[PDB]
Amino acid sequence: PQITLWKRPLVTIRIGGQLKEALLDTGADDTVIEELNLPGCWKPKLIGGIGGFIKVRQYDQIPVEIAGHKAIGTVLVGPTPVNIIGRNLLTQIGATLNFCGGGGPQITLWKRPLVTIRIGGQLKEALLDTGADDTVIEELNLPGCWKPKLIGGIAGFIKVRQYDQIPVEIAGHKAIGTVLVGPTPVNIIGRNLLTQIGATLNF
Ligand SMILES: CCCC[C@@H](CN[C@@H](CCCC)C(=O)N[C@@H](CCC(N)=O)C(=O)N[C@@H](CCCNC(N)=[NH2+])C(N)=O)NC(=O)[C@@H](NC(=O)[C@@H](NC(C)=O)[C@@H](C)O)[C@@H](C)CC
């Protein structure tokens, strides 16, 4: 299919013989699912995101059907806020990110989808994250009025400053919208701006 990003890219998956809902997440290296039992042995791991880290159980070589497409790979199980399908399985099902519906660059998911952005007259690197509702940029002295906000990721919540109507050029494509500024470990471009540049998931 081709999936646009006006809504969360939620899909049904089948795993261990059970159906679950999960978010297609280009900003996640790995696939993380809420607590459940999986056949096979597991080992302890920690994974991170906004706010730090959680403990998970790593299961290897798990079959997962994702919208009807087969994958067999690593599934982390633990207290994630949302079930996410990460790049390890997205690559198996042939998923790419495409600008302007495929008229623009195609970004494969073998490595983190990092691109150059321009914001407040600065160039920065940022991750295209279909699993992010909002755009979050590392602490940056933007002039202007802001409102406080809290946003939440794998390890908890962080406090950010919300600025509205900020232009953000993404790989040469002009967007304008809300930007959150705070202590993120990676600058994140979320769906609010991805939709403006016609970015789609395709597989
Ligand atoms: C879990 C909630 C949905 C997925 C997540 C994907 N975000 C990326 C951000 C990338 C880092 C800043 C992420 O968590 N990626 C993880 C996913 C876990 C995983 N293992 O794949 C990752 O790749 N982690 C790497 C990064 C390294 C961590 N640090 C380190 N090694 N030192 C890792 N392998 O642990 N989205 C979010 O965290 C966003 N949250 C949301 O969009 C929504 N919030 C919630 C609570 O659902 C909305 C309601 O606010 C944040 C950014 C606010 C807009």
Side-chain angles (χ1 to χ4, degrees), residues 1-35 37-45 47-139 141-149 151-203:
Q2 175 173 75
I3 294 175
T4 58
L5 294 168
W6 296 98
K7 300 174 223 196
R8 288 177 191 163
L10 297 168
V11 299
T12 300
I13 68 174
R14 210 163 52 73
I15 177 170
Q18 157 171 74
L19 306 182
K20 303 195 141 286
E21 179 149 51
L23 184 64
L24 303 174
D25 188 0
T26 55
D29 297 341
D30 309 304
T31 291
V32 193
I33 301 300
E34 67 205 341
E35 276 283 309
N37 307 110
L38 273 168
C41 295
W42 52 273
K43 52 169 174 201
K45 193 188 188 192
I47 50 163
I50 282 206
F53 287 77
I54 57 165
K55 291 156 59 179
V56 298
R57 307 195 322 261
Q58 178 175 327
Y59 292 82
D60 290 322
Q61 226 168 306
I62 296 298
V64 180
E65 190 157 22
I66 299 156
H69 284 72
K70 288 173 207 97
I72 303 172
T74 300
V75 176
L76 307 179
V77 175
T80 175
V82 183
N83 296 329
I84 52 179
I85 310 302
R87 294 186 299 96
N88 71 310
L89 299 185
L90 297 172
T91 56
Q92 291 196 17
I93 69 181
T96 57
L97 279 165
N98 296 268
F99 283 41
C100 314
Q106 167 163 111
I107 294 172
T108 64
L109 296 175
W110 298 114
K111 62 173 180 165
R112 289 184 305 162
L114 294 167
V115 297
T116 303
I117 66 172
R118 192 180 75 183
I119 179 168
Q122 300 220 286
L123 298 177
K124 297 194 167 304
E125 195 167 45
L127 181 71
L128 306 179
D129 187 359
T130 58
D133 287 357
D134 304 315
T135 291
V136 192
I137 299 302
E138 229 299 85
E139 280 291 334
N141 291 51
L142 286 176
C145 321
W146 54 274
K147 67 180 133 128
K149 183 173 177 83
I151 60 178
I154 249 159
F157 289 74
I158 56 167
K159 186 172 176 193
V160 298
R161 303 187 312 274
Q162 176 184 329
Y163 291 90
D164 299 322
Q165 307 284 58
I166 305 297
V168 180
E169 198 184 72
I170 301 147
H173 298 75
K174 300 186 177 295
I176 173 163
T178 299
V179 173
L180 311 183
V181 179
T184 177
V186 196
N187 294 322
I188 292 159
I189 303 302
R191 294 182 299 97
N192 74 307
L193 295 183
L194 298 168
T195 52
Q196 291 183 6
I197 66 174
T200 62
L201 285 165
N202 298 78
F203 61 103

